[PDB]
Design a protein around this ligand. Structure first.
Ligand code: HEM
Length: 153
């Protein structure tokens, strides 16, 4: 459970993300693939791309970054009350995409990196800690749902 003030810090920086969801999503996915190249293997559509410029030119990558951030933003706006939003996400990510929790850690690291790089004045230590807690809660709850579906990832 985050405090109300922590949730407000999370949602304050998230509004900045919403000014350019697609550019933030591109930077986050590219950071994820640069830091953890194995994750790129999960995206059949563009797993063959080799340079940063190719990744920035990929319409599929840009669309997927929007998909991820749109879903995550809706989750964050629930302020922890996100069982109904997590249910379909756990279903697909446990049974079809097979995304282990460690990969959700990797993408959390990429999110924090991009938010700090782009919005340092709105992402100091207390806001970073709030976002860390919110992403940890997301990962904890989706791991529990993973197990309910038989996936130990
Ligand atoms: C904040 C974490 C994430 C969120 C909110 C998120 C959300 C979504 C959503 C809403 C979709 C489309 C609907 C669905 O299939 O459920 C999707 C698809 C997908 N996600 Fe995730 N995702 C996250 C993390 C990841 C990570 C870390 C990976 C891989 C390392 C991944 C791999 C995929 C793949 C492969 C698809 C299907 C792409 C396609 O076939 O078009 N996701 N994600």
């Amino acid at each position: 459970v985050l405090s109300e003030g922590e949730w407000q810090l999370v949602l304050h920086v998230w509004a900045k993300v919403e000014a350019d969801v697609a550019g933030h999503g591109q930077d986050i996915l590219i950071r994820l693939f640069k830091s953890h190249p194995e994750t790129l293997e999960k995206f059949d559509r563009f797993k063959h791309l080799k340079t940063e410029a190719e990744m920035k030119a990929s319409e599929d990558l840009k669309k997927d970054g929007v998909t991820v951030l749109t879903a995550l933003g809706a989750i964050l706006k629930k302020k922890g009350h996100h069982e109904a939003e997590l249910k379909p996400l756990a279903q697909s990510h446990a049974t079809k995409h097979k995304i282990p929790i460690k990969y959700l850690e990797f993408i959390s690291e990429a999110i924090i990196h991009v938010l700090h790089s782009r919005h340092p004045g709105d992402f100091g230590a207390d806001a970073q800690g709030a976002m860390n807690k919110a992403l940890e809660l997301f990962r904890k709850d989706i791991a529990a749902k993973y197990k309910e579906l038989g996936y130990q990832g």
